[PDB]
């Protein structure tokens, strides 16, 4: 059974936990930072071991997951300009800890269901293009893009491993 260690990074409140809950537990409440579940992606049974982190008290565990993380979701919220601005910092942090320019990553613009938008889709597409990674628009509330975000990351890890 293939195992993938995934890390979901981004500013506080962008919906990292909400995205992961929706993926793993299939629900959303508008009111756990680690998850572990087996799913089937493209017919391959895959154990996902996931950490959600903004960069929290358990720094040692964070450093471990950053070092061993095989793929990263870089999450911002479409109604949070600062969270979009923070993405570069998170990506640079990952590249440094992993000592590599070729780390599987997906850019995720969450809260796509909300009518308040301050980050344009073109801005995000442009940034992802510069990084050479996929961009996926998501909503943890409506499930838009959720499986696609995580499964695309798993596919980016596979591309990296072979
Ligand atoms: N409308 C909407 N609210 C969301 C979405 N994702 C998260 N939230 C809400 O945003 C707030 C912060 O989410 P949370 O998962 O705790 O963010 P985290 O700090 O990145 O883990 C919560 O009130 C969530 O219900 C989304 O896609 N749409």
Short mmCIF file of C-alpha atoms and ligand atoms in Angstrom, two decimals:
data_model
loop_
_atom_site.label_atom_id
_atom_site.label_comp_id
_atom_site.label_asym_id
_atom_site.label_seq_id
_atom_site.Cartn_x
_atom_site.Cartn_y
_atom_site.Cartn_z
CA UNK A 1 0.00 0.00 0.00
CA UNK A 2 1.49 3.29 -1.14
CA UNK A 3 1.56 6.02 1.49
CA UNK A 4 1.71 9.74 0.71
CA UNK A 5 2.72 12.27 3.35
CA UNK A 6 0.93 15.53 2.52
CA UNK A 7 1.21 18.94 4.13
CA UNK A 8 -1.39 21.66 3.76
CA UNK A 9 0.18 25.07 4.40
CA UNK A 10 -1.23 28.58 4.37
CA UNK A 11 -2.28 31.48 6.60
CA UNK A 12 -4.56 31.04 9.59
CA UNK A 13 -8.22 30.88 8.61
CA UNK A 14 -7.89 30.14 4.88
CA UNK A 15 -9.66 26.79 5.34
CA UNK A 16 -6.89 24.19 5.56
CA UNK A 17 -8.69 22.19 8.23
CA UNK A 18 -12.03 22.66 6.48
CA UNK A 19 -10.60 21.36 3.19
CA UNK A 20 -9.02 18.34 4.87
CA UNK A 21 -12.20 17.56 6.88
CA UNK A 22 -14.22 17.74 3.71
CA UNK A 23 -11.83 15.38 1.93
CA UNK A 24 -11.53 12.86 4.77
CA UNK A 25 -14.80 13.12 6.71
CA UNK A 26 -17.06 14.47 3.94
CA UNK A 27 -18.62 17.37 5.84
CA UNK A 28 -18.39 21.11 6.52
CA UNK A 29 -19.43 23.13 9.59
CA UNK A 30 -19.21 26.93 9.37
CA UNK A 31 -18.55 27.36 13.10
CA UNK A 32 -7.86 18.18 14.34
CA UNK A 33 -4.78 19.33 12.41
CA UNK A 34 -3.79 15.78 11.37
CA UNK A 35 -5.66 13.18 9.37
CA UNK A 36 -5.02 9.69 8.03
CA UNK A 37 -7.21 7.80 5.54
CA UNK A 38 -6.99 5.29 2.72
CA UNK A 39 -8.52 6.26 -0.57
CA UNK A 40 -8.25 5.06 -4.15
CA UNK A 41 -6.76 7.45 -6.69
CA UNK A 42 -6.71 6.39 -10.32
CA UNK A 43 -7.28 2.85 -9.08
CA UNK A 44 -4.23 2.91 -6.78
CA UNK A 45 -4.91 2.45 -3.08
CA UNK A 46 -3.19 5.32 -1.34
CA UNK A 47 -2.86 5.98 2.40
CA UNK A 48 -2.91 9.78 2.87
CA UNK A 49 -1.16 11.08 5.98
CA UNK A 50 -2.01 14.77 6.15
CA UNK A 51 -0.85 17.72 8.31
CA UNK A 52 -2.49 21.18 8.20
CA UNK A 53 -0.12 23.96 9.33
CA UNK A 54 0.23 27.74 9.23
CA UNK A 55 3.75 27.70 10.73
CA UNK A 56 1.65 26.45 15.87
CA UNK A 57 3.08 25.04 19.10
CA UNK A 58 4.38 21.70 17.78
CA UNK A 59 7.26 23.12 15.72
CA UNK A 60 9.34 19.93 15.89
CA UNK A 61 6.51 17.87 14.39
CA UNK A 62 6.06 20.61 11.79
CA UNK A 63 9.74 20.46 10.82
CA UNK A 64 9.52 16.70 10.54
CA UNK A 65 6.47 16.82 8.28
CA UNK A 66 8.06 19.55 6.22
CA UNK A 67 11.20 17.42 5.77
CA UNK A 68 9.30 14.22 5.04
CA UNK A 69 6.31 15.76 3.29
CA UNK A 70 6.20 14.48 -0.25
CA UNK A 71 3.72 17.06 -1.47
CA UNK A 72 2.34 20.43 -0.34
CA UNK A 73 -0.94 22.26 -0.84
CA UNK A 74 -0.31 26.00 -0.79
CA UNK A 75 -3.65 27.39 0.34
CA UNK A 76 -4.93 30.97 0.24
CA UNK A 77 -8.50 32.27 0.41
CA UNK A 78 -9.93 34.31 -2.46
CA UNK A 79 -11.24 36.85 0.10
CA UNK A 80 -7.90 37.23 1.89
CA UNK A 81 -5.27 39.21 0.00
CA UNK A 82 -2.72 38.80 2.75
CA UNK A 83 -3.06 35.01 2.59
CA UNK A 84 -2.27 35.17 -1.14
CA UNK A 85 0.73 37.41 -0.46
CA UNK A 86 1.97 34.89 2.15
CA UNK A 87 2.13 32.04 -0.41
CA UNK A 88 5.62 32.98 -1.63
CA UNK A 89 6.95 32.80 1.93
CA UNK A 90 5.48 29.35 2.44
CA UNK A 91 6.87 28.07 -0.88
CA UNK A 92 10.32 29.47 -0.13
CA UNK A 93 10.24 27.88 3.32
CA UNK A 94 9.44 24.48 1.80
CA UNK A 95 12.15 24.71 -0.86
CA UNK A 96 14.68 25.56 1.84
CA UNK A 97 13.81 22.78 4.30
CA UNK A 98 13.66 20.17 1.56
CA UNK A 99 16.78 21.59 -0.11
CA UNK A 100 15.20 21.18 -3.54
CA UNK A 101 13.75 23.19 -6.41
CA UNK A 102 11.56 20.27 -7.50
CA UNK A 103 9.02 19.70 -4.72
CA UNK A 104 5.45 18.61 -5.61
CA UNK A 105 3.03 21.45 -4.88
CA UNK A 106 -0.41 22.64 -5.83
CA UNK A 107 -1.71 26.19 -5.41
CA UNK A 108 -5.21 26.24 -3.92
CA UNK A 109 -7.58 29.24 -3.87
CA UNK A 110 -10.18 28.35 -1.29
CA UNK A 111 -13.54 29.89 -0.32
CA UNK A 112 -14.51 30.13 -4.00
CA UNK A 113 -18.16 30.03 -2.97
CA UNK A 114 -17.91 33.46 -1.34
CA UNK A 115 -18.94 36.60 -3.22
CA UNK A 116 -16.21 38.67 -1.57
CA UNK A 117 -13.20 38.32 -3.81
CA UNK A 118 -10.00 40.33 -3.51
CA UNK A 119 -7.65 37.88 -5.32
CA UNK A 120 -8.40 37.48 -9.04
CA UNK A 121 -8.30 34.05 -10.64
CA UNK A 122 -5.80 35.46 -13.19
CA UNK A 123 -3.46 36.57 -10.36
CA UNK A 124 -3.44 33.05 -8.98
CA UNK A 125 -3.12 31.41 -12.39
CA UNK A 126 -0.20 33.71 -13.13
CA UNK A 127 1.56 32.83 -9.86
CA UNK A 128 1.08 29.10 -10.33
CA UNK A 129 2.43 29.38 -13.87
CA UNK A 130 5.55 31.13 -12.56
CA UNK A 131 6.03 28.32 -10.03
CA UNK A 132 5.31 25.60 -12.58
CA UNK A 133 2.50 24.05 -10.49
CA UNK A 134 -1.21 23.46 -10.85
CA UNK A 135 -3.78 25.97 -9.53
CA UNK A 136 -7.15 24.66 -8.32
CA UNK A 137 -10.06 26.75 -7.08
CA UNK A 138 -11.82 25.11 -4.13
CA UNK A 139 -14.65 25.45 -1.68
CA UNK A 140 -14.63 23.35 1.48
CA UNK A 141 -18.26 24.42 1.86
CA UNK A 142 -19.60 23.21 -1.52
CA UNK A 143 -16.88 20.57 -2.16
CA UNK A 144 -15.86 22.35 -5.37
CA UNK A 145 -12.33 21.22 -6.31
CA UNK A 146 -11.58 19.42 -3.04
CA UNK A 147 -10.87 15.89 -4.33
CA UNK A 148 -9.19 17.47 -7.37
CA UNK A 149 -6.79 19.52 -5.21
CA UNK A 150 -5.59 16.57 -3.16
CA UNK A 151 -5.62 14.03 -6.01
CA UNK A 152 -3.74 16.40 -8.29
CA UNK A 153 -1.09 16.72 -5.57
CA UNK A 154 -0.83 12.91 -5.35
CA UNK A 155 -0.36 12.90 -9.12
CA UNK A 156 2.38 15.54 -8.81
CA UNK A 157 4.16 13.32 -6.26
CA UNK A 158 4.00 10.36 -8.62
CA UNK A 159 5.43 12.48 -11.45
CA UNK A 160 8.27 13.42 -9.12
CA UNK A 161 8.99 9.82 -8.05
CA UNK A 162 9.15 8.45 -11.60
N1 LIG B 1 -17.58 29.93 3.03
C1 LIG B 1 -16.51 29.16 3.28
N2 LIG B 1 -15.98 29.18 4.49
C2 LIG B 1 -14.90 28.40 4.72
C3 LIG B 1 -14.30 27.62 3.64
N3 LIG B 1 -13.24 26.96 4.17
C4 LIG B 1 -13.15 27.31 5.47
N4 LIG B 1 -14.16 28.14 5.77
C5 LIG B 1 -14.40 28.78 7.06
O1 LIG B 1 -13.29 29.63 7.34
C6 LIG B 1 -12.97 29.57 8.73
C7 LIG B 1 -11.57 29.05 8.98
O2 LIG B 1 -11.45 27.72 8.47
P1 LIG B 1 -10.36 26.74 9.02
O3 LIG B 1 -10.51 25.41 8.37
O4 LIG B 1 -10.38 26.67 10.55
O5 LIG B 1 -9.00 27.47 8.54
P2 LIG B 1 -7.48 27.04 8.85
O6 LIG B 1 -6.92 27.89 9.98
O7 LIG B 1 -6.75 27.33 7.53
O8 LIG B 1 -7.43 25.56 9.20
C8 LIG B 1 -14.00 28.65 9.36
O9 LIG B 1 -15.06 29.46 9.90
C9 LIG B 1 -14.49 27.80 8.21
O10 LIG B 1 -15.85 27.34 8.31
C10 LIG B 1 -14.91 27.69 2.33
O11 LIG B 1 -14.45 27.08 1.34
N5 LIG B 1 -15.99 28.48 2.23
#
